[PDB]
Design a binder for this molecule. Structure first.
Ligand SMILES: Cc1cn(CCC(=O)NS(=O)(=O)c2ccc(Oc3ccccc3)cc2)c2ccccc12
Ligand SMILES: Cc1cn(CCC(=O)NS(=O)(=O)c2ccc(Oc3ccccc3)cc2)c2ccccc12
Ligand SMILES: Cc1cn(CCC(=O)NS(=O)(=O)c2ccc(Oc3ccccc3)cc2)c2ccccc12
Ligand SMILES: Cc1cn(CCC(=O)NS(=O)(=O)c2ccc(Oc3ccccc3)cc2)c2ccccc12
Lengths: 155, 157, 157, 155, 157, 157
């Protein structure tokens, strides 16, 4: 009965995120994507959840749920104590390590880091939005659904 | 007579800070903890509260004193006849920026900066992260002086 | 026919920037300093002021010109028939973020980014730190071109 | 049927290693500690395996096996495709990332990184040996069994 | 007339190297790939083999030539009337050491070093790691020029 | 009564080292430069040569003395009744390894390690790189004290 939580705002979910979801889903019996409620972003929580659900339909053991407050509480309240977090090029890994040690200290939750695929290693939700805002083509970097939804917000 | 200044907002002081204070006090004749007054820096504790929390925490350090300060750190340092800063390193420290500031501070005022890593036990606490965790009911009592922890629960009530 | 773009907000240009300009001008047939402007946040200097300070300190570089822009850097670059960015590295540079943007810029527009470390003497100055230090009286005169220093003091007073 | 491999020379196994073993054993159904054969070290492969087995006796789902050649082959030949690797203070993380991306590329094996506990974050097999060699006390940093075995090699 | 030197042992040349070669050739009038002769550096391919593998790989780059070299890189560079080095960055690059060498090379000879990150697809290959993986039957054919891969299987037989 | 140890192999001492010595001597009552020797590998200079080169370039520091040692640095430090190490940081420093050793040294012996960034001008010299560059004719005269430079050339010839 293994399980891990993949946390983020996912505003919107990128292929970097999806790659890590897929790896977590492949290595743990159960995966929960934890979507932060914290309203200043582009998509509402429902939209962000929809985009992830749309993009992970072939992952039967993954579910998507919103959450707020301490991540470790989100994880523990679901009977788990593992976080799986992706690494990309602009990741502040020092801060990730700090949070990982804090999360272990206060709640006994482990954090496993996995580098996303090289092809998806330079996209981030923020940079994708920024580039798309100014007409740049990020279609190769987002789930096809997300990409269309993004164009909708901009136009 | 040797001396160094340990700078920060300390909002609140953590055991990470205290560990470095203790090491500074052990290695310099005089240590001044310089507590930032910053009207436009958002914070939880007043300067007087922050100073008092540090004084409680450093009661066993007779050669360390706590003072408020504003503006250029190197002026604070040089005004007190010193020319050394002792700053802690923790997990999540922006060390590249620390280096930049250290080189800037040496250039503009001749002040040296000595960095000390805090003990592993206290390496992942920060003032900001302690506040955030405590705000949502997380137990950071092992990472803060007892008196600080008590005051923190007080501000959150 | 070779060429590169040297981007930044240059608010104000520093000697660290000028070092990088000089190296780009020495290695590419033409160099365009791209003064990138956020239309939704005024900096300390207006665009015309930023450009004037850069021109005055680059007058000895015949193959360098200065233009402002906004939006995607790669559009600025490609619209000038170029395909290269030269970006300086200094102490405190967020290199991981620079790498991320370089890989993104190559992906969306085929533009290459060349990084060069600025000279040690100028390696700890940044526009932001120079402004912050000068704000509180610190002497940054040796880290800025003459075209900048007193104009900076002027803005602050 | 989840599983991961924890690889190393483990010469000798430290509490930093053990902490990560325990986390991997807690989060995966099956864990294999892969002990490299590559003879220039202090302990023989049998001794290194013994020390790990001794230190992990309360981990029923962990086993210890020697291996050589490509790690991904070791992992795949056991029906797995996950590596769990620890991070400590002196870890060359850039090289770890390079190897992780290479291992994913050539064999579809994921690497999950987990930071060892702060208390065990500055011990390494090499530094423990070096310090102990010169009379320094590393007993708080090694399994009690290992520590005694180390003193035996030195004296 | 602009120019840069791309230095390495290239034992063997990888698609990471080639990507950077291509970008250099696109941005400078002349590029020289400088192939290290190093009697005490253990290696798999002879200098002539390494040069030939690079030439095969760069056949479409008319302004790039491949030459062997020994000793101080900056002398190699300056002897050919150039004063720029273009070096790739990959995952596992010791960038702090690269920076040190770049600053040293600028100091002793006035030679600039421009760094370019190789494409993400080729960011995790290195000459050493390719050899090690191939030695144990791992497939690195997607990471090497075809001719290189063929020669590599040949050396391992 | 305050004091610190400045450790290294100093083979040879560089101006980067001397910078750190001067800063330690200015901030601690006494400083001991610890010339740490590996009895199982001769460097370029014998212990007496290393010490002589350091003494000649530190003659203006009355509170600094120079001694050799081997084995655990913390034993060298504690045997002199001290509890502090001052270690320089430069470009190319393996800081993670320094941090690891600092935490280990605190753990086994209660000794504190203070890090200080050496001056930008001396930030890219290292004993090893200076030796390598000088080996192939590169001019490192501005990065080494006079007590070293020609003795270095002597060893190489
Ligand atoms: C799977 C994956 C994650 N990341 C990092 C994304 C990230 O941290 N976004 S974030 O805005 O900062 C963030 C972090 C933690 C949070 O904790 C909670 C979440 C829900 C409820 C309460 C707390 C919330 C938001 C990735 C990067 C690349 C490839 C894959 C991945
Ligand atoms: C573990 C540890 C981390 N730090 C860093 C703390 C820090 O930087 N806080 S800060 O908010 O950003 C900051 C920095 C510099 C300042 O300079 C002045 C101070 C007073 C008057 C004028 C200027 C002010 C605030 C420590 C420092 C000392 C011992 C231990 C540690
Ligand atoms: C669980 C854990 C691992 N490490 C890192 C230890 C390490 O890499 N040792 S190593 O000598 O370099 C090494 C690496 C990979 C290898 O791959 C193979 C192994 C067996 C057969 C074929 C290949 C072999 C040796 C840790 C650090 C701290 C806390 C916990 C951990
Ligand atoms: C992806 C990528 C990585 N690198 C680094 C390759 C590298 O450093 N190899 S190295 O063995 O260590 C090396 C370095 C410098 C040298 O200088 C001389 C060369 C010739 C004659 C005298 C000196 C020699 C060897 C690249 C470089 C160019 C384009 C792309 C990339």
């Amino acid at each position: 009965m293994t399980g891990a939580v993949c946390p983020g705002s996912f505003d919107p979910v990128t292929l970097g995120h999806l790659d890590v979801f897929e790896r977590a889903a492949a290595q743990f019996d159960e995966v929960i994507v934890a979507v932060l409620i914290n309203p200043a972003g582009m998509f509402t929580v429902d939209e962000r959840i929809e985009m992830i659900r749309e993009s992970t339909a072939d992952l039967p053991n993954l579910r998507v749920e919103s959450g707020q407050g301490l991540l470790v509480d989100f994880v523990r309240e679901r009977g788990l104590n593992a976080i799986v977090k992706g690494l990309r090029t602009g990741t502040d890994f020092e801060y990730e390590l700090q949070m990982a040690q804090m999360n272990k200290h206060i709640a006994g939750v482990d954090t496993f880091f996995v580098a996303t695929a090289p092809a998806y290693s330079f996209v981030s939700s923020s940079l994708a939005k920024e580039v798309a805002t100014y007409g740049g083509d990020v279609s190769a970097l987002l789930p096809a659904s997300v990409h269309q939804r993004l164009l909708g917000k901009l136009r």
